[PDB]
Structure 1
């Protein structure tokens, strides 16, 4: 179990395609992930109140069960994150439904991952929401992450908007 710290940017300009072109030369491409996420809720412990999440993700066929704890920051998206790979999404989903969990929502996206000296940049195109960028830092303080993101958006002339909301939260709002 461990802290996941990231900054999320809603992209205003340019397109993510153009941003890929701008970073293509100094950032190393890692992989492209087609991610379909199912989120769950507990009938007797509303997660919306507790700021918790239970997610079953299918990323390029790999199945991941993830618990996310409440946010620990107002400057960045910082939450405790516990993940395990499971063998079958259908059966893990059935087990969750059998235990009383109810499917609350679905989030689908294409994520392109880039690495730059201990930073992971994820160009996210979120089905029905739009184009976003997420940055994470490997062994980095909240101040190091904030500083790198400032340098990142400036170096590549990105118009943007910061948010600590989850894709699930923002998709609700968008609807």
Structure 2
């Protein structure tokens, strides 16, 4: 389900959580993770070498699923790769040796569901609110426009309207 070097993703503010959850049942979504606490440690060089390339690098821990991930997003839009890791602090220390250090941390509650080829995330960030992301990962750059349009259609199906789309990342929304 998570296979690819491209991730096409749309983020929406969630105005009506009830309708979203009702649609997740109607469409027989399968829960991949439920109400996990997700702590993301963002890493960069002293001089923000990665941000200057529109790269983000994250070590993610999700509890109680026990998933731990090293994620490199970028450079620029729609590029994303991730690896499962056994130990966040181990990889964090390895990356510190290479010059990458904790820049800030983002915490959220997140559930992840699958419906056919699509992933749908339902997120809550203290102080910011409720969001949902609709995404599909692919290795094929030739269908990215089609895939993004399919995500927008799919989202509408959960009550997520064109006008609730949020182009800013959580890092941007949190002032980082």
Q: Give the TM-score band, short-chain normalised.
A: 0.7 to 0.9
Compared with structure 1, are the counterparts of its residues 88 and 158 closer, same or farther at alpha carbon in structure 2 (3 Å cutoff)?
A: closer
1:4 corresponds in structure 2 to 7
**What's 1:67 paired with?**
72
Cα-to-partner distance string for 1:68-112 (whole Å, 9 max, x where unaligned): 11223xxxxx1x222222222122222222332221111111222
Q: Partner of 1:96 in structure 2?
A: 95
RMSD: 2.4
TM-score (normalizing by structure 2): 0.79
Alignment-derived partner of residue 19 in structure 1: 20
| 4+ long deviations beyond 4 Å | none
| Structure 2: unaligned runs, 5 residues or longer | none
TM-score (norm 1): 0.79
Unaligned runs of 5+ in 1: 73-77
Which structure features the higher share of strand residues?
A: 1
On the 8 A contact 2:8/2:137 being kept in 1, the answer is no
> How far apart in 1 are the matches of 2:55 and 2:101?
14
